[PDB]
Structure 1
């Protein structure tokens, strides 16, 4: 247990704490401006000159003094209440406030010993911000206290709420930009309070950083009427409080006293909600939220060159862009830095006075030190049930290609038992698709958590105020909840219809970049569990839906995060259920990855045994010797290669026809896609020798690919024999139609695959056979048209074991 959670003070904030908060605010304002502007001479010792100003002024002042003010008060809160606390910096461009925070709390020097607590350290701290060889401009993963960089805006609230799931002692003040609140993902994020439980989860306090402006515009929320702003948050299930400061001549000490008192009313109400939830955990309370209305750029010069700067979008980035070049700008910078009176805040040796920091929390309650903000220090391996019990044994008993299993059901049974073994640290998310993607065996041990109205057991099933499944019709919520759940040291998986995974492409990009920075250069940030995404209800079998639901292209996005041997991205094609089991165990053990696990949920053949799946997964690609009919590679007329459940089904049927014609070939299945890349691009891929052994040195390869053929072409560009690969993939063809038609129109059906194989072998010789196969596809199509279902010869085919 960290600290003493949800305790009220029952006394006013002390005058000593108010004095320390104003010193904090002034010192973090001063150091934030030093980080942006100063290359040397951080204490402005004589001579202080333009030569001390950075040649390239980059970074953001506007948001920053409001964040420094809240951080003073959140620090004071944490210390007085001993409250386990992670904050979210929605306006992540306020990096300097987050680095100042860590430098003041002592974690910066603890994690970065060269950046010491004295004039030499402070000089280096100022120079390195946004600087070549230095540190980023945003609240990056290399800052102690960050679980959310906030570079791409919109995910502040999904992260805040994912962090408090199953974390009942944790408090998350979530600082949201008022421009950020104009984004889609943030706008839906407010509604998460219908999906957390006040007894079993922790508490988010949204703080709207209503500074009136985004980069070059006012914001929507700051200019609507007060009555609309309050109704809006009340209608989203919050009790709105609002604080207004900085627009008149009110002295800063009164501002701190008024804010501390308000913040204590807010926290008392959170503590009442937490206490009440021990007895009534079914009534959804109105959680407080805070509207925090202060001037953008607060405490910078009111006007610069005749233009209003404090209280304006002009304060957004870097005021005084000529601070190095003019002297008029230099004098303004100088008076601005002086207004904080650093001579009272730093000792002669350049260490921050004890005065400034006596009110601060200590030890693991410090914002930089809390292990929830470095959740790998708390993560434990999952207690995984043995895989063998889930195996589809029909392939051992009856043969390769047996049955009509719905593959994700085996993963559901496995997830069920994971939740049973790990009842408060493994969650499932879905955007209203958990049952649709067949992971509903999980409901045998838990419910979808829903903290909003109930009506009737005739309609409410597998749903309760507490539980380990979470659904909301929003891929942004599912992805963002899961990310923070992982970043705070827990585990889980989510599932999405494949085409809609694209809604969150850009979130995958940011989490991949968080991982990249981390595996490269932040070894104190310990490994977290991986994002595990079941990509299902795929392009080939969207039976109730049509062309809008046919887009397997997240493969292609993921290919753009496969650099430098970071190894933070995996693309797996689950050939069948036993392959799915083997991939999933590996993903549930992995850390520091995004794993995209492709599987069909339609009834489908099971191809491999579990033991086979386990060996084939590890190689990445394997020959299926029981399916090949060639003696060796020299006798092979074509390589039949497949990635995905449906391409594999269609290639298998093609191999069966090709065998019966006396064509000699081998069958290669591809599971771990990126292991096709060269060793030069991927030090864990198949070696050239292993690749040649699979795909031959010079025979034609027919490659039937689940997604866009572009992917495979670009990946094998420098591989031996790559010029002989013919890649067939999805090509933007299809609609609401039968299963054969959907493969037919992309040349993916078995008849077209057989034809393509014949054509690669000898186009002249098999010209008639090819015609005949093409004519057969037409006839099968007409049959579907005339009759309403696919030709029995297509649907009834099973691979020659039985």
Structure 2
């Protein structure tokens, strides 16, 4: 549960002191100096003579354009924090402005506190400049390596979804969220503005959007800087914001005036925020118009206005570096020298190379500092969830009537379970879902909380299970749902979201970035404590999108997640819920886990339950398992074939194939896979099955029929170095399907029980069985023709029950 830090939502009531503003100007000037330094200088940080091109980096890596803008804002936010004692986390949309984030951390004292090698003296200042975007050094973005960051801003557009996740169930948290005007052109950013109808000003914190309207992205102007100011204002008002606009640096107005104007404006907005928060103590059912700030300043603010006759300040040319080289010529190095001198470092640094005390006297102390605030390292806040007994959700009926029982909808059991997680962990757990929580069958959670909704109510006949405050949130944007949950985890809370499988792909790129964040964190950032896993229920999956058709039939998220399964990072979970009981086992493991993206593939369709809780726990701990009770073979030598399934439906088709093989008197072994990564080469993954364990399950010499939920390519590439790999005959989804019957879905993809049975015969003795094979292919066409003619499936397919079930 988020901590109450500082003295939240306090008005100042006095003007901002001239003293504190002189601080901010110094912060600004020194942060700009540190920022140019990190880009340009390998040595001689303070320009002690002789200062020459030998001091300048060979390759210029880093972004200036965004950075002076960031430095001004952060300077002013640091003043704000100190004077008000406000719990504040910043979201740096333009994450390519990493020099501003490292500067902030250097100057607030979290950098030295975290990297003691980087000292508050000339020598520390020198390693500090060299390390930036430099071999064996630090990233060029506001990376997880930087104290203060929960958002890299590498991949643009998640600034607002991250900002609004952070404040959820975080009533003391202020989040000034800085958004690139280029970033604002992305789809994820454009929908993120609407988050203000999904948060409550009493129970959640406050996000102040700051649009960094610097006029440009890389090689273009931005749309929002070149529409009318009037359009820009209606735009933000229409999305439920009170827009304030600040314009500085397009004229000769001196720095002190700029700082005085800004500080008055900032305090006027803050006053408005303190009134929103004070009102919300009495009235949290009326949605307020939340302030947002349009920060219009020239890109590259304070760089040379022109370089080699090209406009540089207030241009896209300042995007990366305004001065392409400071080595090629003396005239160029001279521009660097002048530029660095214009911040007057002689005033900012004492002879020992430390920043003077009067630069940083206005700065916050302790856990209020941007870099030290525990919300920016949410691991330190994160508690274990109080979990209910998994026993109470177990489908007991498998133990009663045998493996293969029933027509249960597995995701309902995950719903009962998550419901009680929310009940027992209020303010600490959230379900997100893109208008799919009921569709994926997770609505049992509506018994103990509601869908959070802070737009209009109209009627009890339609507005069911909705309140201004609640642990479930739903918007039709996978981006928003991935986004909110990511930031809710980064600030030390927990959750699950669900998606139709096909549409997980919408946020493939966001899985990549959070995976990279997690990969970087577990390799080389041990100060950044572990966060709860991004748990993702993948359901309404390909084999039962027979009702929605081809658009909804893509299980390929499996393939994407496999490209983040390296270096024994163990940040990817890929689980196949065989049934309700396997789903509970996976669920508990995932909800206990940390530093992972967990993807749980589970059906919502009525389906058999195969395992007891115990059998599922067992299969899950190793990842795969022989099903002895299902196997006509007694050991691997007797076995003529290995029937292996991954996914609840493949399991179903394999078990049914197994009953037809059973009647022809074939000896076969049945294998279930629940953990895809258990099959990964034991060379690449220390948690996979050993080649010995693998060979014991898949036999080493017998052919294996593998029925796989997703695309067969996934397995053929996982097991390339595995014992017996060349005897694996892998069936998976094959881009066949439409709106049809469950049976046609498996049939047309050659993973139906009939084809599986036939395939198993072909692989034992083709000629010996030529006629039972030919009988099976004929029936395959007859059952299809039965569906075409009757509009439901042949009763052979429909009415089948595993032989192992008794009345």
Residue 56 of structure 1 aligns with which residue?
59
Which residue of 292, 308, 311 maps to 1:305? 308
Residue 597 of structure 1 aligns with which residue?
600
**TM-score using structure 1 length:** 1.00
Secondary structure, aligned partner of 1:668: strand
The reply on whether 1:636 has 2:639 as its aligned counterpart is yes
The reply on whether 1:787 has 2:790 as its aligned counterpart is yes
Which residue of 734, 740, 744 maps to 1:731? 734
Residue 71 of structure 2 aligns with which residue?
68
Residue 185 of structure 2 aligns with which residue?
182
Residue 473 of structure 1 aligns with which residue?
476
The reply on whether 1:343 has 2:358 as its aligned counterpart is no
Secondary structure, aligned partner of 1:703: strand
Which residue of 485, 491, 496 maps to 2:494? 491
Which residue of 429, 432, 435 maps to 1:429? 432
Residue 620 of structure 1 aligns with which residue?
623
Residue 613 of structure 2 aligns with which residue?
610
The reply on whether 1:94 has 2:115 as its aligned counterpart is no
Residue 384 of structure 2 aligns with which residue?
381
Q: Displacement of 1:543 after TM fit? A: 3.7
Q: Deviations over 1:660-699 (max 9, x none)?
A: 1110000000000111012101011101110000000110
Alignment of 1:428-447 (within 5 A): 428-447=431-450
Residue 38 of structure 1 aligns with which residue?
41
Secondary structure, aligned partner of 2:301: coil
Residue 299 of structure 2 aligns with which residue?
296
Q: Displacement of 1:771 after TM fit? A: 1.4
Q: Displacement of 1:431 after TM fit? A: 0.2
Deviates further, 572-581 or 675-684: 675-684
Alignment of 1:369-768 (within 5 A): 369-768=372-771
Secondary structure, aligned partner of 2:346: helix
Residue 319 of structure 1 aligns with which residue?
322
Residue 361 of structure 2 aligns with which residue?
358
Q: Deviations over 1:309-359 (max 9, x none)?
A: 000000000121220121111000000000000000011000011110000
Secondary structure, aligned partner of 2:245: strand
Runs (5+) with no aligned partner, structure 2 = none
Which residue of 790, 798, 801 maps to 2:801? 798
Q: Report the Cα distance in structure 1 between the residues aligned to 2:508 and 2:201, rounded to whole angstroms.
A: 31
Which residue of 260, 267, 271 maps to 2:263? 260
Which residue of 136, 139, 164 maps to 1:136? 139
Residue 164 of structure 1 aligns with which residue?
167
Q: Report the Cα distance in structure 2 between the residues aligned to 1:543 and 1:685, rounded to whole angstroms.
A: 34
Q: Report the Cα distance in structure 2 between the residues aligned to 1:459 and 1:611, rounded to whole angstroms.
A: 42
Residue 332 of structure 1 aligns with which residue?
335
Q: Deviations over 1:393-419 (max 9, x none)?
A: 110111100011100100000000000
Q: Report the Cα distance in structure 1 between the residues aligned to 2:197 and 2:537, rounded to whole angstroms.
A: 25
Contact 2:415 2:445 in 1 (8 A): yes
Residue 237 of structure 1 aligns with which residue?
240
Residue 287 of structure 1 aligns with which residue?
290
Q: Report the Cα distance in structure 2 between the residues aligned to 1:707 and 1:715, rounded to whole angstroms.
A: 13
Q: Deviations over 1:603-649 (max 9, x none)?
A: 00000000111111001000110000112100100000000000000
Q: Report the Cα distance in structure 1 between the residues aligned to 2:285 and 2:766, rounded to whole angstroms.
A: 70
Contact 2:546 2:737 in 1 (8 A): no
Q: Displacement of 1:770 after TM fit? A: 1.4
Secondary structure, aligned partner of 1:493: strand
Secondary structure, aligned partner of 2:496: strand
Q: Displacement of 1:4 after TM fit? A: 0.5
Q: Report the Cα distance in structure 1 between the residues aligned to 2:765 and 2:331, rounded to whole angstroms.
A: 81
Q: Report the Cα distance in structure 2 between the residues aligned to 1:187 and 1:102, rounded to whole angstroms.
A: 30
Secondary structure, aligned partner of 1:764: helix
Which residue of 56, 79, 83 maps to 1:80? 83
Secondary structure, aligned partner of 2:628: coil
Q: Displacement of 1:19 after TM fit? A: 0.2
Q: Displacement of 1:765 after TM fit? A: 1.8
Q: Displacement of 1:776 after TM fit? A: 0.5
Q: Report the Cα distance in structure 2 between the residues aligned to 1:322 and 1:582, rounded to whole angstroms.
A: 58
Q: Deviations over 1:84-138 (max 9, x none)?
A: 0000000000000000000000000000000000000000100000000000000
**TM-score using structure 2 length:** 0.99
Q: Displacement of 1:501 after TM fit? A: 0.0
Secondary structure, aligned partner of 1:354: coil
Residue 272 of structure 2 aligns with which residue?
269
Q: Report the Cα distance in structure 1 between the residues aligned to 2:477 and 2:153, rounded to whole angstroms.
A: 20
Secondary structure, aligned partner of 2:767: coil
The reply on whether 1:222 has 2:225 as its aligned counterpart is yes
Q: Report the Cα distance in structure 2 between the residues aligned to 1:687 and 1:58, rounded to whole angstroms.
A: 44
Q: Deviations over 1:526-581 (max 9, x none)?
A: 00000000000000101431100000000000000000000100100000000000
Q: Displacement of 1:189 after TM fit? A: 0.3
Q: Report the Cα distance in structure 1 between the residues aligned to 2:454 and 2:531, rounded to whole angstroms.
A: 28
Q: Report the Cα distance in structure 2 between the residues aligned to 1:765 and 1:336, rounded to whole angstroms.
A: 86
Q: Report the Cα distance in structure 2 between the residues aligned to 1:401 and 1:418, rounded to whole angstroms.
A: 29
Which residue of 20, 24, 29 maps to 2:27? 24
Q: Displacement of 1:39 after TM fit? A: 0.2
Contact 2:398 2:405 in 1 (8 A): yes
Q: Report the Cα distance in structure 2 between the residues aligned to 1:228 and 1:767, rounded to whole angstroms.
A: 74
Q: Report the Cα distance in structure 2 between the residues aligned to 1:444 and 1:286, rounded to whole angstroms.
A: 31
Q: Report the Cα distance in structure 2 between the residues aligned to 1:777 and 1:327, rounded to whole angstroms.
A: 80
Q: Report the Cα distance in structure 2 between the residues aligned to 1:262 and 1:5, rounded to whole angstroms.
A: 19
Secondary structure, aligned partner of 2:242: strand
The reply on whether 1:209 has 2:212 as its aligned counterpart is yes
Secondary structure, aligned partner of 2:292: strand
Q: Report the Cα distance in structure 1 between the residues aligned to 2:480 and 2:398, rounded to whole angstroms.
A: 39
Contact 2:184 2:190 in 1 (8 A): yes
Q: Displacement of 1:14 after TM fit? A: 0.5
Q: Displacement of 1:769 after TM fit? A: 1.5
Secondary structure, aligned partner of 1:208: strand
Secondary structure, aligned partner of 2:139: coil
Contact 2:786 2:794 in 1 (8 A): yes
Secondary structure, aligned partner of 1:626: helix
Contact 2:546 2:745 in 1 (8 A): no
